[PDB]
Design a protein around this motif. Structure first.
Motif, PDB file in Angstrom:
ATOM      1  N   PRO A   1       9.566  -7.061  10.501  1.00 14.61           N
ATOM      2  CA  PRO A   1       8.608  -7.812   9.679  1.00 14.61           C
ATOM      3  C   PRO A   1       9.148  -7.941   8.051  1.00 14.61           C
ATOM      4  O   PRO A   1       8.759  -9.295   7.836  1.00 14.61           O
ATOM      5  CB  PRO A   1       7.446  -6.936   9.962  1.00 14.61           C
ATOM      6  N   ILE A   2       9.527  -7.251   7.623  1.00 13.42           N
ATOM      7  CA  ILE A   2      10.055  -7.077   6.268  1.00 13.42           C
ATOM      8  C   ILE A   2      10.987  -8.168   5.946  1.00 13.42           C
ATOM      9  O   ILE A   2      10.680  -9.178   5.100  1.00 13.42           O
ATOM     10  CB  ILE A   2      10.782  -5.947   5.771  1.00 13.42           C
TER      11      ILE A   2
ATOM     12  N   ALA B   1       8.178 -12.576  -8.730  1.00 13.72           N
ATOM     13  CA  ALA B   1       8.854 -11.988  -7.392  1.00 13.72           C
ATOM     14  C   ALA B   1       7.888 -10.758  -6.821  1.00 13.72           C
ATOM     15  O   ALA B   1       7.406 -10.950  -5.678  1.00 13.72           O
ATOM     16  CB  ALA B   1      10.313 -11.406  -7.707  1.00 13.72           C
ATOM     17  N   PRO B   2       7.560  -9.734  -7.681  1.00 13.64           N
ATOM     18  CA  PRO B   2       6.649  -8.825  -7.100  1.00 13.64           C
ATOM     19  C   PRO B   2       5.347  -9.379  -6.775  1.00 13.64           C
ATOM     20  O   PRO B   2       4.507  -8.852  -5.823  1.00 13.64           O
ATOM     21  CB  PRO B   2       6.485  -7.865  -8.193  1.00 13.64           C
ATOM     22  N   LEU B   3       4.782 -10.294  -7.380  1.00 13.65           N
ATOM     23  CA  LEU B   3       3.632 -10.941  -7.288  1.00 13.65           C
ATOM     24  C   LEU B   3       3.363 -11.404  -5.709  1.00 13.65           C
ATOM     25  O   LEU B   3       2.614 -11.343  -4.991  1.00 13.65           O
ATOM     26  CB  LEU B   3       3.023 -12.163  -8.266  1.00 13.65           C
TER      27      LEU B   3
ATOM     28  N   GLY C   1       4.572  -8.978  -2.387  1.00 18.70           N
ATOM     29  CA  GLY C   1       3.505  -7.899  -2.294  1.00 18.70           C
ATOM     30  C   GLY C   1       2.395  -8.775  -1.942  1.00 18.70           C
ATOM     31  O   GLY C   1       1.585  -8.231  -0.801  1.00 18.70           O
ATOM     32  N   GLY C   2       1.982  -9.909  -2.300  1.00 17.78           N
ATOM     33  CA  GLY C   2       0.703 -10.676  -1.951  1.00 17.78           C
ATOM     34  C   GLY C   2       1.052 -11.030  -0.424  1.00 17.78           C
ATOM     35  O   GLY C   2      -0.078 -11.099   0.194  1.00 17.78           O
TER      36      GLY C   2
ATOM     37  N   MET D   1       2.714  -9.323   1.541  1.00 20.05           N
ATOM     38  CA  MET D   1       2.593  -8.180   2.300  1.00 20.05           C
ATOM     39  C   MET D   1       1.276  -7.779   2.360  1.00 20.05           C
ATOM     40  O   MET D   1       1.043  -7.257   3.620  1.00 20.05           O
ATOM     41  CB  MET D   1       3.356  -7.021   1.589  1.00 20.05           C
ATOM     42  N   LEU D   2       0.299  -7.952   1.583  1.00 14.73           N
ATOM     43  CA  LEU D   2      -1.017  -7.747   1.823  1.00 14.73           C
ATOM     44  C   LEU D   2      -1.574  -8.382   2.887  1.00 14.73           C
ATOM     45  O   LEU D   2      -2.494  -8.071   3.759  1.00 14.73           O
ATOM     46  CB  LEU D   2      -1.800  -8.115   0.511  1.00 14.73           C
TER      47      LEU D   2
ATOM     48  N   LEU E   1      -0.330  -9.146   5.848  1.00 18.75           N
ATOM     49  CA  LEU E   1       0.143  -8.413   7.310  1.00 18.75           C
ATOM     50  C   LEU E   1      -1.066  -7.456   7.357  1.00 18.75           C
ATOM     51  O   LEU E   1      -1.326  -7.058   8.440  1.00 18.75           O
ATOM     52  CB  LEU E   1       1.502  -7.925   7.023  1.00 18.75           C
ATOM     53  N   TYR E   2      -1.147  -6.445   6.428  1.00 16.32           N
ATOM     54  CA  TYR E   2      -2.372  -5.549   6.518  1.00 16.32           C
ATOM     55  C   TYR E   2      -3.543  -6.045   6.976  1.00 16.32           C
ATOM     56  O   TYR E   2      -4.147  -5.742   7.981  1.00 16.32           O
ATOM     57  CB  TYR E   2      -2.424  -4.501   5.181  1.00 16.32           C
TER      58      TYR E   2
ATOM     59  N   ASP F   1      -3.090  -5.379  11.068  1.00 17.92           N
ATOM     60  CA  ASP F   1      -3.387  -4.061  11.231  1.00 17.92           C
ATOM     61  C   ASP F   1      -5.032  -3.894  10.991  1.00 17.92           C
ATOM     62  O   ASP F   1      -5.813  -3.274  11.697  1.00 17.92           O
ATOM     63  CB  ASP F   1      -2.579  -2.924  10.445  1.00 17.92           C
TER      64      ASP F   1
ATOM     65  N   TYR G   1       1.531 -13.509   9.371  1.00 20.05           N
ATOM     66  CA  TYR G   1       2.846 -14.444   9.238  1.00 20.05           C
ATOM     67  C   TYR G   1       2.616 -15.826   8.815  1.00 20.05           C
ATOM     68  O   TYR G   1       2.902 -16.432   7.895  1.00 20.05           O
ATOM     69  CB  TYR G   1       3.862 -14.432  10.498  1.00 20.05           C
TER      70      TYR G   1
ATOM     71  N   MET H   1       1.813   2.892  13.914  1.00 10.87           N
ATOM     72  CA  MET H   1       0.726   1.869  13.292  1.00 10.87           C
ATOM     73  C   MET H   1       0.739   2.267  11.748  1.00 10.87           C
ATOM     74  O   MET H   1       0.151   1.948  11.050  1.00 10.87           O
ATOM     75  CB  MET H   1      -0.453   2.658  13.841  1.00 10.87           C
TER      76      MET H   1
ATOM     77  N   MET I   1       2.581  -1.200   9.101  1.00 12.16           N
ATOM     78  CA  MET I   1       1.963  -2.215   8.636  1.00 12.16           C
ATOM     79  C   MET I   1       1.057  -1.741   7.363  1.00 12.16           C
ATOM     80  O   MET I   1       0.945  -2.487   6.555  1.00 12.16           O
ATOM     81  CB  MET I   1       1.037  -3.136   9.988  1.00 12.16           C
TER      82      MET I   1
ATOM     83  N   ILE J   1       3.409  -1.108   4.501  1.00 10.24           N
ATOM     84  CA  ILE J   1       3.462  -2.658   3.881  1.00 10.24           C
ATOM     85  C   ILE J   1       2.420  -3.004   2.999  1.00 10.24           C
ATOM     86  O   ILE J   1       2.396  -3.654   1.890  1.00 10.24           O
ATOM     87  CB  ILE J   1       3.802  -3.604   5.087  1.00 10.24           C
ATOM     88  N   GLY J   2       0.973  -2.673   3.707  1.00 11.97           N
ATOM     89  CA  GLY J   2      -0.068  -3.212   2.711  1.00 11.97           C
ATOM     90  C   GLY J   2      -0.376  -2.408   1.420  1.00 11.97           C
ATOM     91  O   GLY J   2      -0.500  -3.059   0.349  1.00 11.97           O
TER      92      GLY J   2
ATOM     93  N   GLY K   1       2.512  -3.284  -0.805  1.00  8.97           N
ATOM     94  CA  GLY K   1       2.277  -4.815  -1.298  1.00  8.97           C
ATOM     95  C   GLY K   1       1.133  -4.683  -2.498  1.00  8.97           C
ATOM     96  O   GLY K   1       1.454  -5.327  -3.499  1.00  8.97           O
ATOM     97  N   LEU K   2       0.278  -3.847  -2.182  1.00 10.77           N
ATOM     98  CA  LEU K   2      -0.891  -4.013  -3.484  1.00 10.77           C
ATOM     99  C   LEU K   2      -0.007  -3.334  -4.457  1.00 10.77           C
ATOM    100  O   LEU K   2      -0.444  -3.997  -5.536  1.00 10.77           O
ATOM    101  CB  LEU K   2      -2.010  -2.963  -2.845  1.00 10.77           C
TER     102      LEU K   2
ATOM    103  N   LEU L   1       2.919  -3.535  -5.642  1.00  9.59           N
ATOM    104  CA  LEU L   1       3.605  -4.696  -6.120  1.00  9.59           C
ATOM    105  C   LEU L   1       2.779  -5.778  -6.845  1.00  9.59           C
ATOM    106  O   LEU L   1       3.222  -6.126  -7.728  1.00  9.59           O
ATOM    107  CB  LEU L   1       4.355  -5.482  -4.829  1.00  9.59           C
ATOM    108  N   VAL L   2       1.773  -6.070  -6.304  1.00  9.54           N
ATOM    109  CA  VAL L   2       0.954  -6.991  -6.853  1.00  9.54           C
ATOM    110  C   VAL L   2       0.247  -6.753  -8.253  1.00  9.54           C
ATOM    111  O   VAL L   2       0.303  -7.289  -9.199  1.00  9.54           O
ATOM    112  CB  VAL L   2      -0.300  -7.690  -5.765  1.00  9.54           C
TER     113      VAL L   2
ATOM    114  N   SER M   1       2.643  -5.974 -10.831  1.00  9.97           N
ATOM    115  CA  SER M   1       2.950  -7.151 -11.642  1.00  9.97           C
ATOM    116  C   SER M   1       2.047  -7.779 -12.621  1.00  9.97           C
ATOM    117  O   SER M   1       2.389  -7.765 -13.674  1.00  9.97           O
ATOM    118  CB  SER M   1       2.947  -8.263 -10.418  1.00  9.97           C
TER     119      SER M   1
ATOM    120  N   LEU N   1      11.685  -4.960  -9.039  1.00  9.40           N
ATOM    121  CA  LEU N   1      10.601  -4.839  -7.756  1.00  9.40           C
ATOM    122  C   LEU N   1      10.637  -3.275  -7.610  1.00  9.40           C
ATOM    123  O   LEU N   1       9.367  -2.826  -7.634  1.00  9.40           O
ATOM    124  CB  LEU N   1      11.457  -5.286  -6.554  1.00  9.40           C
TER     125      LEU N   1
END
Ligand code: K
Lengths: 419, 415
Positions: free
Chosen positions: A63-64, A219-221, A224-225, A227-228, A230-231, A235, A248, B1, B4, B7-8, B11-12, B14-15, B18, B283
């Motif tokens: 997925p990454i 980039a990190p915005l 990760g945005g 990435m959020l 997907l959760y 999930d 996706y 499980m 994911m 990843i959540g 990602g949080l 990271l945002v 940032s 990153l």
């Protein structure tokens, strides 16, 4: 689960892969089949990297890497230039898509003696239904062909990249999931939800980027945005609602509209993302193809070599063209033009990633929850057939394109009648 | 499980990281402290990310990003410029490093009533002693300093990161129940080997990259090669020949030789690499600082806030100064310059990453800890105190050095 092992295999993959792709560029050969060959070499042939290990690594880095390609594919071009041919785009991206996956399903079933109602074949088609943009990106750019054709193909590719996942996501429910009562319902839920939420966060990021100069910190915005997404997408949301959307496709939509919003309005923050993701996309590109060639089992390979190859032929020469004709029966395009579109669009990285992901998700989950009708065929050989079939499909389509490009482009772009 | 969700959360991080970083960049203030505060916010305060889960993710992504940071400074560093001030640098990463380490660990032991031979304190020092270049580099040029001290502090801050990691791994061996080999043997082993294999792969890559224009394709080639070096050193080779091998220092060395060679050969492929690493190194730098603030538990704060504070000041006002002066005891620099080197050595990314890594390494693999150093202090308390200590150390050092940077440069580096 050995993290250092995973890092090692990923390392070898990146080194040898990058070298290979470089050699491919130095000889004007498409990188894809060479990457696949390498994957087979270090895969079953040399047994440097075992199957199960590659599967477990891909279970994480899947997925990454998949989130990268969708991004990179969403920034490579914009939708402010589609207003000319957007109709042909939509029809070719929807109708031709569905038809192609259907006929491909018929073929896949009829080859492996599977019933014509077997969800296996339809899953295969759903995976292979999406085409690859970056594959045909050099072969059209160097040509800079009739802009209509070019941007049409780009649009179709980029727009079919998500739907293929969505289509694959829906069909997988039939194989066993928490619900999957009706495919249409979850299709509407996934598509619509991804559109809504994705466009929401797209507007948010738009306004949040325009008002400042993030520069390097873009980039990190977005990453990760994404990435959020997907959760919240796959999930989290079902835990509270059972339903949800494909994270996706949400990523693809968000990034696309965001790019076009960073291009309609003019922020300097834009140029980083493209250059960032494109370099980021290249990693996932090299990474996926090699690991696809490793997930093959030598025995399984020898067992389903010939049939899959024949299935691939059915997809390229029969499925795709038929779907093209049937999808463009009311078009302003020439027969030679429709034939161009037919023998053009090849498959690529998305069907590969989806193939392996389907394989591992089945082996890990369907072992516990196998559909009875489907259980008559070992899920082992289900994943095997899907994966190897996709493999030979990618290979064959790509090489065929590599020999198709020039000859076909010249011999089919001749008329263009003026009204 | 778990995937994911990981990843959540990531990602949080990271945002939010940032956005926070941008806020700091706007208000003319460093991002690091605000990032740590953010980590504390979504960590114990808001309980958005459970500490156990944070450490659980960091078990995976931690070592990954650690390659990025080390790769980051590597290419930014060029050797041909150091030749004028290299003698100062060598001391600044050798004797000064060792002394700073020993003193910081000394004080660390003395605070919590631990014997002056407790490996815990020296572990803290090992984690702490690594100065960070990513906070020196945006600051140094803005204040119009002399070139030499800029190049010098950059060189030190970069060379420290590997040696900090190496030393951290060496001391970790003493926390190993089933074996406790000779420290010097492991040190020379890991270091020397890193030099060798590093130079080897860096030579291969030198020829390969120089010969043809890779453009974008250096990214998998270099990162992959970096990824390759870790598995060899920290897994395969010791499972084979038995003798260990550091991967991180090897990676750093490789980036140094390679980068300097490409820069010397005017191969434009060099820039294509730098752009890639700088982003990646940004990153993980965000991802590292956030999780550090999340790995901390509320108890750790309410039981080790103040102790870690006192330890921090010792590292900044006692350790590093004495280390600098004693290291440059024969140097022909200036007192003002020495004091400048002393009062500017921020603990940054690497100490945080090593703090979390060691933290989980101890907390998880706890029961099999030697009881000699356990009788004095609970392993839970060890991990907590090291994490908190590193936290306060970093925050204080960064904030103080940043606020005092201007006046320091003003009345010191004028020869
Ligand atoms: K070159």
């Amino acid at each position: 689960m050995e993290l250092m092992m995973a890092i090692g295999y990923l390392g070898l993959a990146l080194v040898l892969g990058s070298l290979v792709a470089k050699i491919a560029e130095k000889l004007k050969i498409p990188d894809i089949p060479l990457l696949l060959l390498l994957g087979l070499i270090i895969g079953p042939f040399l047994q440097i990297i075992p199957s199960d290990s590659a599967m477990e690594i891909f279970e994480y880095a899947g997925p990454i890497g998949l989130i990268f390609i969708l991004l990179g594919g969403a920034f490579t071009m914009r939708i402010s230039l589609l207003k000319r041919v957007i109709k042909t785009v939509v029809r070719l991206d929807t109708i031709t898509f569905l038809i192609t996956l259907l006929i491909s399903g018929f073929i896949f079933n009829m080859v492996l003696n599977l019933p014509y109602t077997s969800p296996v074949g339809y899953l295969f088609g759903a995976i292979t239904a999406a085409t690859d943009p970056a594959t045909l990106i050099p072969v059209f750019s160097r040509v800079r062909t009739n802009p209509e054709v070019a941007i049409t193909l780009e649009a179709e590719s980029i727009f079919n990249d998500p739907l293929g996942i969505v289509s694959t996501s829906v069909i997988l429910g039939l194989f066993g999931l928490f619900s999957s009562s009706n495919p249409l319902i979850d299709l509407i839920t996934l598509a619509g939800g991804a559109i809504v939420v994705g466009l929401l966060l797209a507007k948010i990021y738009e306004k949040i980027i325009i008002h400042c100069d993030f520069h390097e910190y873009v980039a990190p915005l977005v990453l990760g945005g994404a990435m959020l997404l997907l959760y919240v997408g796959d999930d989290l949301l079902p835990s509270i609602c059972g339903y949800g959307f494909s994270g996706y496709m949400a990523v693809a939509i968000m990034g696309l509209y965001l790019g076009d919003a960073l291009f309609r309005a003019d922020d300097i923050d834009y140029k980083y993302i493209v250059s960032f993701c494109d370099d980021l996309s290249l990693l996932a590109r090299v990474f996926i193809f090699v690991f696809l060639g490793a997930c093959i089992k030598l025995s399984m390979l020898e067992n389903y070599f010939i049939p899959g190859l024949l299935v691939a032929l059915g997809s390229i020469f029969l499925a795709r063209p038929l779907g093209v004709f049937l999808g463009l029966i009311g078009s302003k395009h020439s027969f030679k033009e429709k034939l161009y579109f037919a023998l053009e669009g090849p498959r690529g990285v998305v069907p590969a990633a989806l193939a392996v992901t389907v394989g591992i998700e089945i082996l890990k989950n369907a072992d516990k929850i196998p559909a009875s009708i489907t259980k008559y065929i070992t899920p082992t050989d289900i994943a095997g057939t899907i994966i190897i079939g996709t493999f030979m499909t990618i290979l064959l389509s790509v090489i065929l394109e590599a020999s198709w490009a020039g000859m076909l482009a010249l011999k089919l772009l001749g008329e263009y009648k003026p009204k």
